[PDB]
């Protein structure tokens, strides 16, 4: 499914 | 829910979608520029691991933090803009960012 970097982008990645 | 950046981006991202997450950060940087940190500074985490790396620089960050009366499924937030170092906890290989451990 989602893997924990891809988690870490969706949630506190805006560039 | 608001018409701020933080009600929107957070229900956008699955964030509040179903439930309120009391406090999230959103960095506005490069996600080129954010895996960079994992090779940057070595500290260590608050758990006391020491896979932690902290930005050479401040980056552009928005924090949001839910407001007293914040209730689902109507959560509210309260933005608030700043500059600030980031530090993140990697993992795997490619070594990139796997938890957002704070901002300094």
């Known amino acids: 499914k989602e893997t924990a970097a891809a988690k870490v982008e969706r949630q506190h990645l805006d560039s | ?104």
């Open chain 2, 1 to 104: 829910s608001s018409s701020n950046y933080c009600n929107q981006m957070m229900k956008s991202r699955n964030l509040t979608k179903d439930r309120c997450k009391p406090v999230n950060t959103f960095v506005h940087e490069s996600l080129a520029d954010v895996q960079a940190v994992c090779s940057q500074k070595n500290v260590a985490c608050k758990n006391g691991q020491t896979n932690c790396y902290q930005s050479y620089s401040t980056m552009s960050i928005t924090d949001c933090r839910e407001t007293g009366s914040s209730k689902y499924p109507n959560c509210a937030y309260k933005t608030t803009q700043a500059n600030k170092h980031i530090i993140v906890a990697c993992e795997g290989n490619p070594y990139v960012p796997v938890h957002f451990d704070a901002s300094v």
